[PDB]
Design a protein around this nucleic acid. Structure first.
Lengths: 221, 98, 217, 71, 25, 83, 132, 129
RNA sequence: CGCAAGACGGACCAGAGCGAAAGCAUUUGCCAAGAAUGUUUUCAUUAAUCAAGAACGAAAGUCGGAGGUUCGAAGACGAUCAGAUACCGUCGUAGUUCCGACCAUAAACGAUGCCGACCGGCGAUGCGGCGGCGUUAUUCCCAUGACCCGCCGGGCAGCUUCCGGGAAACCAAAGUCUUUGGGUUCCGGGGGGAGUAUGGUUGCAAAGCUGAAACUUAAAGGAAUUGACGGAAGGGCACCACC
C-alpha cells in the first residue's frame, strides 16, 4: 500500500520538492516510478480498456494464447498516455497496461481556431502521427465541432481534453494498436511543433537534480 | 524476397558474361556466378613422398604439383560440400574461411 | 580556459603531454575530430593540437565542478589502460568509478544492483565504452570523452582529443583532469606543482608489476 | 498526378477518362454488356412464371438443400 | 500446371482453331 | 499561447536546443542539459554561477553536440577565441 | 560428474563475503564454521558448501577472484596501488620529437624548449598494410 | 534539367534546416528567390542572408534559426483570386494563427495577409511555417 | 610422328572495363566511332521528356545458299522402373557455325523510366587531370613509365550510420510525401475467366502488337514471426545406439 521510491526523481516527488509533472516534462526526465503520475493527476486519471487482443505463439503442442490489453489513460485537462501490456491472462495485462499508460503520459498543447479568446479548445496546428501503415492527421476546428474521428482516436482525443478537432486517417486503421499509437504519437507532437509563440529564447531554469541536490544526499542514496 | 544483394553472381555493370561448364556435373553456369576454386596439390600426398623420393634417380629432386582451376555448378558445389548455407548475419561475410 | 592567464597552458604541462604521447593520434581520422588536429606526419599518424586538448580539458573540468554533489559523477573505463586512472580520479574528486565490465541496464533498469543514476559521465574511450554512452541516451546524461583522432563522437558532449590508446597518455590525461577539477574547486593552489605524481594513475603491465615484486632488494 | 503543367488540362482529363475503364464498378455501368446480360434488363424486380421447383445443394462447408424455383 | 506449359497448351489449342476456321475459306 | 486578455494559457513553456532551436519534447531522453561553471578572472575558482546549455537528443545522436557546445562556450567567452 | 550447483556456489560466495575473517585453508574447521554462521539444512550440502569455500579461500590466497567483495579491497588494490617510483617516466631529460609537432608548438607560446631533441624526419611514406 | 529555380532554393534550405545547419548555400540565384527570402526574413523565419555576385547568376548564403518548420514552392504558379486565398491557406498552412503563403501580386511578391489589406490577388509562389 | 576440317578462345579474367540495350576476350593492321578528364576555345538557350514515325534487338524458330568438328530437340536403341514415350548411357536428323533475308521475343532483371537539385561518414577500385618526401628502370642528367602519399572530376561498386523512408525485407535511394506541387513519358486498379474469344494489323510460317465480355469468386497475394516438416548443413547425447 505504501510507496517507497527507488529512483532519484521519484524520491524528490514524494518529498514535495518538485510539485508539477510540468516541471518534470520541462527537463525531459524519464518517469519510471508508477506513483509519480498517480500522485499529481491521481483524483482525475480515468481508464478505458480500448481492446483485449488474443495473440498466439504456435508451439510443438498447440497454440500458446497471451492477451494484449491496450489502455488509454488521461485527465480531461491536457494529459494522455497509451499503454500496451501483453500477459498470460487479461486481468494482469489490463493492470500492467494501466501502469504503462500512466508511465507513458505526455502533455498535450492545445490552441485556438481563429479567435484566441477563453481557454484553448482544439489542437494548436495540423499535427500528423504514424505507426506501421497508419497515418493520423489532426486539424484544428472551431468551438462546438467536437472530435470528428473513429471511435478509437475519439477515446484518446476526448481523454486528451481536446474539445474540438477534425481528424483524417490513412492505412489499416482496423489494427487498433497502430491506430491508437498513431493518434497518440500525433497528440504527443503538439509540444514538439515549434510555433511562433515559442520563438523567445528560453531562460534556462535549474533541474530538480541540481535545485534539490542537498536534500537527495541525506534522504536516500 | 531478394536473398542476395549481388544476385548470387559478381556482375554489376555488364549485362552478359560468357558461361563455363561445372566440372562435377556439366551445366552451363555464368563465370562470375560459378564457385571457382584453385587447387595446387602434390601428385602424391604423404604415403608415396616417402617411397618415390627413396627411388629418385636424383639427389634432392623436388616433386611437381598439379595446378587445376575447378569451376562448380551451385548444386555441383553444395552437394560436394565446397560451400555451406550460412545464417543471414554470416551470409554477408566475404572473407575466405581460415 | 579562454582569454585568461591563470588557466593558460604552462610549460611542465606541455612536457607532461609530449612525454606521455597525447599529441600522437591514430592513422585514421573521424570526420567530427578534424577540428582537434594540426597536421599528419610521414607514417600517416595525425598530430593533435595540445592547446585545443587543454581547452577541452578545462571545459570538461569546468562541467565536472558545476555538479554540486560530486558522488554523482560516473568515471567509466572498460579497457585495461584507464581502469586504474579512473579508480584514482574518483579517490581525488569524490566521484563514483566503474572500472572494467559495465553491466547493461545500470542507468536504465531501476531494479538492478548496480543502478547508479549520475548527473555527468566521463569516458576513457567512446568505442570501447559505447554501452554507457548509449545508456546515457536513455536517462539524460551529459558525457565527457577521452577521444583518439578516430573515436566516434556519437553521444559525446565534450571530446578531449588525446592518445587514449597508450597507457602513459591515459594516466596523464586523467591526472590533468583530476588536478584541474580540484584546482577549480579550490582543494589545491595553482602555484604548487601538485604533490600527487602522474605516475600514480599509469596502468602497469603485469610484466612491470612482477618487475617491482623482484627489484625491491 | 504525374504532369503538373499549368497547360496540361487535357492530358490529365484524357488520362483519367482512359483509366476509369480499368475500374470494375465503372466498366460494368458504362457498357451495354452488363445491362443486356442482366436477366432483369436493369429493372429492380420482375414477374415470372414458375416452371419447376428446384432443390439446390448448399456450398462446401454447411450442407442443406436450398429450395429455389425455376422461372 | 507450370505457366509456360499452360501457354504451350493454349498456343496449340489456338493452332487447332486456325484449322477448323481454315475449311470455310 | 496568450488569450485576448493576454494570459499565458499553455500549461508549460518548453526548453529548446541552445544549438538549433528545436523544442525539446517531454520524452526526449537523449537530450543533454549541461552546467558549465565560470571562474574568477585572477583566482581561477568556481564562483557559484554557471552558463547552462541544452541540446535536443537529435543533434546529440548526429554526434555534432561536441562542436555545438564548443561554439556555445567560444561565443560565451568560456573558451579561447584563438583555440 | 562433480560440478557444484548454484545453491552451493552462491552460499559459499556470500559466506566468504560476510565471514572472510573466520575462514582459512582447513576443510574440517570451515565445515564447522558453516554450521555456526548459517542454517544449512543438510550435511551433504554443508560439506559441498564448506568444500567450495576452501577451494575459493585458496583462490583468494592467490590473486583477486571475480565474483566476491571483502573488507580491505584487498591490500594489493588499496595499499599497493599507492606505489610511485623516485622520478616519473614523464621526467625525460631528452624528449624525442618530430619536426611537425615542433611546427605546432612554434605556433604556440612554446617555440623553444631546452629538453626537446628534434629528430631528422622519417623518409619514404610506407605505413599501410598491403591488400589481400 | 533545372526549370523552377525557386523550387531548388526552398527545398535546399528546407533539407538544410531539417539537418540543423546554421547556414546554407543555394547555388543558382534569381530576383524571385531574393524577394521570397526577404518575405521569410521580415517574419523572422530565416536570418539575414547574403547574395554572392559572380558575373553569372548569383549564389545566396542564408543564415538559419530553427523557426522554419518547412518552406516550399507550389509548381505550377496557379492564379489566386481573393475568393480562393481562404481555400489555399485552409489546405496549405498548418494553422490560421501562423504560416504565410507567398504569392506574386502586381503590387509585389508578398505574404497572403498583405495581399488581403492591399486587396490584390495573383499567382501563388510558395508557403512557409 | 604427321596431315585435314570445323568449332572455340582456357589459365591471365576481377563484384574490373566498354557499350543505348541485346552484347563484347588470341596477334597485328586499317576504318570510322565514343565516354571521361583538360581548357582564360567557340556558338549562345540551341534544352528536358516524349502520341506519330524510326534504328538496334540473346536464344530458339522460318526461307535460299555454303560448311558440317563437337554437342544434340525428334527418332533408334541400351538400362532403371510397377510403368519411364523421363532423369542415366551409346548412336543420332533438324539444329548448333558462316553468308543473304525474315522473326521482334526472354526472369530482354537492378523484377527499380529519363532529366535536375539537395541531404551522412568511411577505405578501396577504374579512367583523366593536378600536387608531394622517397625507391627503381631507359643511366648520362632530364622527362617519362612502375610503386609510394594526397586532392579534384566522371564511372562500376562495397562497408557503415536512429538522415529519412518503408508493410516489412530492405533503400545514400526506394530519402528530401498529410509539413502532400522541380519537369515529363509509359503504366496498375481484388482473384480467376485471359493475354482467351473476336476484329484489325505485321509475318512465307511459327507467331507478334492491339484486346474484351458473359461467367465465376471471398479471398488470391506481399513481408516478417512462431511452430511442425526436409530425401539440406553443422553440433550433441544414449549399451531401450554402435564399437
Amino acid at each position: 500500500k505504501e510507496w517507497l521510491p527507488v529512483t532519484k526523481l521519484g524520491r524528490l516527488v514524494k518529498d514535495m520538492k518538485i510539485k508539477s509533472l510540468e516541471e518534470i516534462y520541462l527537463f525531459s526526465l524519464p518517469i519510471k516510478e508508477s506513483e509519480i503520475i498517480d500522485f499529481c493527476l491521481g483524483a482525475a486519471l480515468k481508464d478505458e480498456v480500448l481492446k483485449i487482443m488474443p495473440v498466439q505463439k504456435q508451439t510443438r503442442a498447440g497454440q500458446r494464447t497471451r492477451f494484449k490489453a491496450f489502455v488509454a489513460i488521461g485527465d480531461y485537462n491536457g494529459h494522455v498516455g497509451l499503454g500496451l501490456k501483453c500477459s498470460k491472462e487479461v486481468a494482469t495485462a489490463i493492470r500492467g497496461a494501466i501502469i504503462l499508460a500512466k508511465l507513458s503520459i505526455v502533455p498535450v498543447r492545445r490552441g485556438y481556431w481563429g479567435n484566441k479568446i477563453g481557454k484553448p479548445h482544439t489542437v494548436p496546428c495540423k499535427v500528423t502521427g504514424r505507426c506501421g501503415s497508419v497515418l493520423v492527421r489532426l486539424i484544428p476546428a472551431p468551438r462546438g465541432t467536437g472530435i470528428v474521428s473513429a471511435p478509437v482516436p475519439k477515446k484518446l482525443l476526448l481523454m486528451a481534453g481536446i474539445d474540438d478537432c477534425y481528424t483524417s486517417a490513412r492505412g489499416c486503421t482496423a489494427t487498433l494498436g497502430n491506430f491508437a499509437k498513431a493518434t497518440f504519437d500525433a497528440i504527443s507532437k503538439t509540444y514538439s511543433y515549434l510555433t511562433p509563440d515559442l520563438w523567445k529564447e528560453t531562460v534556462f531554469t535549474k533541474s530538480p537534480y541540481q535545485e534539490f541536490t542537498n536534500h537527495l544526499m541525506k534522504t536516500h542514496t | 524476397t531478394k536473398k542476395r544483394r549481388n544476385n548470387g553472381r559478381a556482375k554489376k555493370g555488364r549485362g552478359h558474361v560468357q558461361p563455363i561448364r561445372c566440372t562435377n556435373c556439366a551445366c552451363c553456369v555464368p563465370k562470375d556466378k560459378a564457385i571457382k576454386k584453385f587447387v595446387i596439390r602434390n601428385i602424391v600426398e604423404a604415403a608415396a613422398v616417402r617411397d618415390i623420393s627413396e627411388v629418385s634417380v636424383f639427389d634432392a629432386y623436388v616433386l611437381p604439383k598439379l595446378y587445376v582451376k575447378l569451376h562448380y555448378c551451385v548444386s555441383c558445389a553444395i552437394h560436394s560440400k565446397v560451400v555451406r548455407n550460412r545464417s543471414r548475419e554470416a551470409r554477408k561475410d566475404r572473407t575466405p574461411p581460415p | 580556459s579562454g582569454a585568461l592567464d591563470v588557466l593558460q597552458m604552462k610549460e611542465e604541462d606541455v612536457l607532461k603531454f609530449l612525454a606521455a604521447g597525447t599529441h600522437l593520434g591514430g592513422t585514421n581520422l573521424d570526420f567530427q575530430m578534424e577540428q582537434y588536429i594540426y597536421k599528419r606526419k610521414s607514417d600517416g599518424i595525425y598530430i593533435i593540437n595540445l592547446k585545443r586538448t587543454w581547452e577541452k580539458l578545462l571545459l570538461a573540468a569546468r562541467a565536472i565542478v558545476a555538479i554540486e554533489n560530486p558522488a554523482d559523477v560516473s568515471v567509466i573505463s572498460s579497457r585495461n589502460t584507464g581502469q586504474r586512472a579512473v579508480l584514482k580520479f574518483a579517490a581525488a574528486t569524490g566521484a563514483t568509478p566503474i572500472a572494467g565490465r559495465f553491466t547493461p541496464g545500470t542507468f536504465t533498469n531501476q531494479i538492478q544492483a548496480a543502478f547508479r543514476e549520475p548527473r555527468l559521465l566521463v569516458v576513457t574511450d567512446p568505442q570501447a565504452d559505447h554501452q554507457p554512452l548509449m545508456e546515457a541516451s536513455y536517462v539524460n546524461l551529459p558525457t565527457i570523452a577521452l577521444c583518439n583522432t578516430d573515436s566516434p563522437l556519437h553521444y559525446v558532449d565534450i571530446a578531449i582529443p588525446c592518445n587514449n590508446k597508450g597507457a602513459h597518455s591515459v594516466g596523464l590525461m586523467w591526472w590533468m583532469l583530476a588536478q584541474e577539477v580540484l584546482r577549480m574547486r579550490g582543494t589545491i593552489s595553482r602555484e604548487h606543482p601538485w604533490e600527487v605524481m602522474p605516475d600514480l594513475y599509469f596502468y602497469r603491465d603485469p610484466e612491470e608489476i612482477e618487475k617491482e615484486e623482484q627489484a625491491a632488494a | 498526378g504525374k504532369c503538373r503543367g499549368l497547360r496540361t488540362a487535357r492530358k490529365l482529363r484524357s488520362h483519367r477518362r482512359d483509366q476509369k475503364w480499368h475500374d470494375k464498378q465503372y466498366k460494368k455501368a458504362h457498357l451495354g454488356t452488363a445491362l443486356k446480360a442482366n436477366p432483369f434488363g436493369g429493372a429492380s424486380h420482375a414477374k415470372g412464371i414458375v416452371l419447376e421447383k428446384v432443390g439446390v445443394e448448399a456450398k462446401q462447408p454447411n450442407s442443406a438443400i436450398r429450395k429455389c424455383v425455376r422461372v | 500446371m507450370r505457366a509456360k506449359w499452360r501457354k504451350k497448351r493454349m498456343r496449340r489449342l489456338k493452332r487447332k482453331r486456325r484449322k477448323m476456321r481454315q475449311r470455310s475459306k | 499561447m496568450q488569450s485576448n486578455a493576454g494570459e499565458f494559457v499553455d500549461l508549460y513553456v518548453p526548453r529548446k536546443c541552445s544549438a538549433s532551436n528545436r523544442i525539446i519534447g517531454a520524452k526526449d531522453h537523449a537530450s543533454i542539459p549541461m552546467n558549465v561553471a565560470e571562474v574568477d578572472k585572477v583566482t581561477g575558482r568556481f564562483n557559484g554561477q554557471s552558463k547552462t546549455y541544452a541540446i535536443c537528443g537529435a543533434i546529440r545522436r548526429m554526434g555534432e553536440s561536441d562542436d555545438s557546445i564548443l561554439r556555445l562556450a567560444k561565443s560565451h567567452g568560456i573558451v579561447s577565441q584563438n583555440f | 560428474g562433480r560440478v557444484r550447483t548454484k545453491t552451493v556456489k552462491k552460499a559459499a560466495r556470500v559466506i566468504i563475503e560476510k565471514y572472510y575473517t573466520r575462514l582459512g585453508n582447513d576443510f574440517h574447521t570451515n565445515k564447522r564454521v558453516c554450521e555456526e554462521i548459517a542454517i544449512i539444512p543438510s550435511k551433504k550440502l554443508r560439506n559441498k558448501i564448506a568444500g567450495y569455500v576452501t577451494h575459493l579461500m585458496k583462490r583468494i590466497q592467490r590473486g583477486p577472484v571475480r565474483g566476491i567483495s571483502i573488507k580491505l579491497q584487498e591490500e594489493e588494490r588499496e595499499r599497493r596501488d599507492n606505489y610511485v617510483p623516485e622520478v616519473s617516466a614523464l621526467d625525460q631529460e631528452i624528449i624525442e620529437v618530430d619536426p611537425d609537432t615542433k611546427e605546432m608548438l612554434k605556433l604556440l607560446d612554446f617555440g623553444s624548449l631546452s629538453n626537446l631533441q628534434v629528430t631528422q624526419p622519417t623518409v619514404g611514406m610506407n605505413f599501410k598494410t598491403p591488400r589481400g | 534539367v533545372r526549370m523552377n529555380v525557386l523550387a531548388d532554393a526552398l527545398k535546399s534550405i528546407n533539407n538544410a534546416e531539417k539537418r540543423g545547419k546554421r547556414q546554407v548555400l543555394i547555388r543558382p540565384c534569381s530576383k524571385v528567390i531574393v524577394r521570397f527570402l526577404t518575405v521569410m526574413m521580415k517574419h523572422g523565419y530565416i536570418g539575414e542572408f547574403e547574395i554572392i555576385d559572380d558575373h553569372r547568376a548569383g549564389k545566396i548564403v542564408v543564415n538559419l534559426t530553427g523557426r522554419l518548420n518547412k518552406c516550399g514552392v507550389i509548381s505550377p504558379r496557379f492564379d489566386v483570386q481573393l475568393k480562393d486565398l481562404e481555400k489555399w491557406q485552409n489546405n496549405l498552412l498548418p494553422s490560421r494563427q501562423f504560416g504565410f503563403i507567398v504569392l506574386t501580386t502586381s503590387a509585389g511578391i508578398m505574404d497572403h495577409e498583405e495581399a488581403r489589406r492591399k486587396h490584390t490577388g495573383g499567382k501563388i509562389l510558395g508557403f512557409f511555417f
